[PDB]
Ligand binder design. Structure first.
Ligand code: 9Z8
Ligand code: K
Ligand code: K
Ligand code: ZN
Length: 398
């Protein structure tokens, strides 16, 4: 059974932000136009018995004062009056400004993603679903008391917390163009949540972490060697990115033997993304880096959580996420998903112009040193955590 987080109020809430606009609606409607909905099990978003219950759930990671400030920000944006100098300072102290401004539904919008990823983690725990997808989730940059990189509430950290607290080990894989710092930092001291982020890293590029510092940091305390990072130069194509990540993915599975896999699948690595950093596609034959990674992760047969994230080219993010969805049905259920190369007719068809095709409109030594560093980190992680593994079978992957 493959699960997908959806709801009528959920769709309205995921579409209420000025940054992401109607992206969620485009993703969900392309999946629906492609006749994928009957193949999926709708996972309804989590709801709470009272306000105190909701607060208890969000504050398992986030500070109460931050949740209070984010709710007060929604309230203030629902009134015409401008903010007092004191309310501006208060918001500035939580970084509820710039990339993370207020808007009339800021709190409902960010809580919705938590509701979706928590319900997704639950459907995996009760074994109702083998895999759950949440294209409204994947807000990897949010910190305990700080909004960051368009992320207010870290739905990933909360989903992972619900999974570990259900020895349970979680492997978190972050495919987004940006370093998955919020998730990495949340589990920095815990060996049970191994985080792995592949991303672009360059001087002045957000967030600045997931690369060499002032050395390469990798966790602290009993969590030492438990945070993995692969920073990549701009211009990487599907094949080089796949070859860079592949042996790493397989080796992490063999050594960690995770109980759950949590995959943030941010679509900002696409060649057609306005960032224009990585040259990844959504091509399925010349295979998409995202599709190669997902297929590899699903072949392990470990309960998996697939989440969204970045992706600023809404129709292209929808084309990728629609293919990831179809691949998951095929990999989990074993039934072929024949997806037409032409966009089917639906209310959002005009957005796929001027050609209306499924493929994105695109024509296509440092890694070896990173592989040797990561292999040694993995061995140190295994030694510290008294994990039994065959050194050679893991070395041979690289
Ligand atoms: O795309 C992501 C998340 S997957 N992160 C990119 C980093 C955010 C960019 C920094 C920023 O603060 N931008 C900004 C500044 C003022 C107003 C609006 C946006
Ligand atoms: K990433
Ligand atoms: K960790
Ligand atoms: Zn991103």
């Amino acid at each position: 059974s493959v699960g997908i987080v959806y709801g009528d109020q959920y769709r309205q809430l995921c579409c209420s932000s000025p940054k992401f606009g109607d992206r969620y609606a485009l993703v969900m409607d392309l999946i629906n136009a492609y006749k994928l909905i009957p193949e999926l099990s709708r996972v309804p978003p989590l709801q709470w018995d009272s306000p105190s219950r909701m607060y208890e759930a969000v504050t398992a990671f986030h500070s109460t004062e931050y949740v209070d400030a984010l709710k007060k920000l929604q309230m203030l944006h629902c009134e015409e009056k401008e903010l007092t100098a004191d309310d501006e300072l208060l918001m500035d102290s939580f970084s509820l400004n710039y990339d993370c401004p207020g808007f009339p539904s800021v709190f409902d919008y960010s809580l919705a993603a938590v509701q979706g990823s928590l319900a997704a983690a639950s459907a995996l725990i009760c074994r109702h679903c083998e895999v759950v997808i949440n294209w409204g989730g994947g807000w990897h940059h949010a910190k305990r008391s700080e909004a960051s990189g368009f992320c207010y509430l870290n739905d990933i950290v909360l989903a992972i917390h619900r999974l570990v607290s259900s020895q349970t080990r979680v492997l978190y894989v972050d495919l987004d163009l940006h370093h998955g710092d919020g998730v990495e930092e949340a589990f920095w001291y815990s060996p049970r949540v191994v985080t792995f982020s592949v991303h672009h890293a360059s001087p002045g590029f957000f967030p600045g972490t997931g690369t060499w510092n002032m050395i390469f940091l990798n966790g602290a305390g009993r969590g030492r060697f438990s945070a993995f990072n692969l920073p990549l130069e701009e211009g990487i194509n599907d094949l080089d990115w796949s070859n860079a990540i592949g042996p790493i993915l397989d080796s992490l599975n063999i050594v960690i033997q995770p109980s759950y896999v949590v995959v943030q699948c941010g679509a900002d690595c696409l060649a057609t993304d306005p960032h224009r950093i990585f040259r990844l596609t959504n091509f399925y034959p010349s295979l998409s880096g995202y599709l190669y990674a997902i297929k590899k992760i699903l072949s392990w047969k470990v309960p998996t959580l697939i989440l969204g994230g970045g992706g600023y080219n809404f129709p292209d993010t929808a084309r990728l996420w629609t293919r990831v969805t179809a691949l998951t049905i095929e990999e989990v259920k074993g039934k072929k998903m024949t997806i037409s190369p032409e966009i089917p007719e639906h209310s959002y068809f005009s957005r796929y112009g001027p050609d209306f095709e499924l493929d994105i409109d695109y024509f296509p030594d440092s890694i070896q040193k990173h592989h040797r560093r990561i292999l040694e980190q993995l061995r140190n992680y295994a030694d510290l955590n008294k994990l039994i593994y065959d050194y050679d079978q893991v070395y041979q992957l690289y």
